[PDB]
Each structure stands twice: as structure tokens, then as C-alpha cells.
């Protein structure tokens, strides 16, 4: 039930008029499509085919870890999770509060644009707080903007400075580009919607 | 030319009357016979079949060394070398000084019993100084009087405390007994001759 149901509440009835309402969510899908291709495919090798040229037991495991603390595809994953949260927390805040107020005062819209159009504004703030909280780590945590073919790893139990080599560090980067590019694009659409709610107040 | 020539000068013409003159040298031969059996036969394995249960590169080499600094058969060897030295230094001091004084005053025995029976007394002192200098190390250097089946070796590059195992540590000990026993026997005969030169002065 992954993706089809998030839209049943995520793509709600009739919220705003900016052409960036759907655009942002079409990417949200696109962006989980690109990742549901990367993950199971290019990262399986991450640990397996990660070769350290040393016979020294401890080394290779320590050399992956010290170098791949939260692997990319689990970061990408967490991103799509956190940045998914505001989207579904709001949609949850709506289908609850709207169903509630309605079926309670029918037997016995200033607060529909009040309560909900307001939490949605802070959501849009949250979205870009996350989309940029990770975009940050993904750029600061991981030694520049990509990964090299080999790394020189000083992991504890290696003898002095040893070599190690990653698997397909280009294919791995390629997908770090797209996912970082679309991570920026999906930042602007998010900030344009935070901009439009700063223009008319 | 090993053994047969040391006797040509070692077992000289007519030195003393104690029945321990030949006895000591018959052992000297016996003792190089037992060692010329041990060495090439039981010690080849020392390093080869010395097994340390660890995958840790440095370890096994360091575990032999830290534990077998001057291997037994090279000690035994050095013994038979040093304790061989006084025997052949004297015999050398004789066949030289005797050949010299003779062929020099023939054309133009108070100093034969003086010079030579005196250096021979200090030789006998030297013999038992060596025979006991090593007998000492061989007992102090090597962790008791024999060797265990396995050792627990803390050699640097092992992970913590590792096991290792020696080759035929009994056959190795067996020959440490004989060679240490005959190292004691050959001490007493040496000291009995230093005793007989202390009795009549």
C-alpha cells in the first residue's frame, strides 16, 4: 500500500491555485520512483564488493563503517520519510478535523481556512526545513558532493594507511546527483509556496 | 673434517692419569653425535609447524620469536662450540709451543709442565665456566626445564591473548634432557679435573 494511499489524503480536494501544488507531488512520486530503483539495485554491493587491500581482520568492516555511517540509500530514504511526514500529518489533520466538525454540528469555514490553512503553512515551512536539513547532511557528512573510486581508510585495526575500493561509485554518484538535484528543485517549490503565503499574508 | 681432526690435537700424546681424561672426550664426541641427530631432524619443524590460532598477520612470527629467541639446537650448538674452544686452544697452544721450543734449541721440560700444564689447568676452569654458563641460560632462559605442547603468546600484533602450538615438544624435550644431563655429567668430569689440580696443587 506504498504511494497510492498517501495520495488519497495527500492530494486532497481543493486547496490553492499556484500550478506548484501538483508539480511538487508529481516529483514526490518521481523521487520515490528513482529511489525505489537505486536502493535494492545499486546499494546491495555497497558492503559486499567494498574491497580493502589488507589481510588485517578488523579493517574492512571498520573501513566501511568509518566511511559509510548512514549509507546514502538510507539517507535518501529518511529524507523521503521526514519530508513525507508534514504532507501526511496535514492531510491527517484535515480528514480528521473536517470529518469531526461536520458530523458534530449537523445534528447537534472561518476555522477551515483558519486551523487548516494555517497548519499547512507551517507544514510547508516544515517540508523545506527537512528537505534542507538532509540536503545539508548529504553534502556535509559525505566528503564533498560525490564518492571516489577508492578511499584511503585509516580505520583502527588496519595496518597504518590502507586502500579500499567502493562499488560503482559513479552509478552511485549519478543517483546522488538526481536525488540531490530533485532535492533542490523540491526545495524551491516548497519555498515558493512558503513565499505565496508570505505575499498575501 | 668435523670431529676427526679436533682429536688429532685434542687427544694428545700423554698428559695425566685419572681415567676421566678420555671419558670426558668420549662424551664430547657422544654429545656432538646426539646433537648432529637432533638438529637437522627435530628442529626443522620448530618454525614451520608452529601454529598460532589467529588470522592476525603479525602474530605467528612474533609468537615464535618472543618465545624461541635462540632456539635450542643453536644453543646446544654454541655450547659444543665454546666448550670446544678451550680444548682446541690448549691443544693449539701445545703443538705450537712444543714444536717451537724443540726445533729452535736443537740446532741453536720445566716449562713444558710449567707453561702448558698451567694453561691446561685454566682451560679446565674455562671448560666448566662455559659448560655451566650455558647450562645456566638453558635453564633460566627457557621457561622451566622443558617446553609445553601449546603456549599462550602475547606477541605484539596478536589480538589479545592467542594460542600457538609447538612441534613435538616432547621429542624436543627428550633431547633437552639428554643434552642437559650430559651437560651436567660433562661438568663434573671437568670439575674433577679442576679438583685433582687443586689437590696436589
From Swiss-Prot, chains A, B:
Localization annotation: Cell membrane; Cell junction, Gap junction
Stated consequence of mutating residue 58 to A: In PPKDFN; impairs trafficking; localizes intracellularly closed to the nucleus; affects the ability to form functional channels; phenotype can be rescued by coexpression with wild-type protein
Membrane-traversing stretches: 20-39, 73-93, 120-140, 174-194
SMART domains documented for this protein: CNX, Connexin_CCC
Topology in the lipid bilayer: Multi-pass membrane protein
Binding residue positions for Ca(2+): 41, 44, 46
Disulfide bond annotation, renumbered to this chain: 52-164, 59-158, 63-153
GO biological process, one term: transmembrane transport
Intramembrane: 1-12
Effect the entry attributes to changing residue 65 to H: In VOWNKL and PPKDFN; impairs trafficking; localizes intracellularly closed to the nucleus; affects the ability to form functional channels; phenotype can be rescued by coexpression with wild-type protein
Gene3D superfamilies, per database record: Gap junction channel protein cysteine-rich domain
Effect of residue 83 to L: In DFNB1A; sorted to the plasma membrane normally and forms gap junctions that were morphologically and electrically indistinguishable from those of control; the mutation reduces the permeability of GJB2 gap junction channels to inositol 1,4,5-trisphosphate (Ins(1,4,5)P3), resulting in blockade of the Ins(1,4,5)P3-induced inward calcium current in neighboring cells
Keyword flag Transmembrane helix: yes
Substitution effect: residue 85 to R: In DFNB1A; does not form gap junctions since the mutated protein is confined in the cytoplasm and not transported to the cell membrane; when the mutation is coexpressed with the wild-type protein ionic and biochemical coupling is normal consistent with the recessive nature of the mutation
Function: Structural component of gap junctions. Gap junctions are dodecameric channels that connect the cytoplasm of adjoining cells. They are formed by the docking of two hexameric hemichannels, one from each cell membrane. Small molecules and ions diffuse from one cell to a neighboring cell via the central pore.
Complex and partners: A hemichannel or connexon is composed of a hexamer of connexins. A functional gap junction is formed by the apposition of two hemichannels. Interacts with CNST. Forms heteromeric channels with GJB4.
Entry similarity comment: Belongs to the connexin family. Beta-type (group I) subfamily.
Disease tied to this entry: Deafness, autosomal recessive, 1A: A form of non-syndromic sensorineural hearing loss. Sensorineural deafness results from damage to the neural receptors of the inner ear, the nerve pathways to the brain, or the area of the brain that receives sound information.
Name of the protein described by the UniProt record: Gap junction beta-2 protein
Organism: Homo sapiens
Gene name as annotated: GJB2
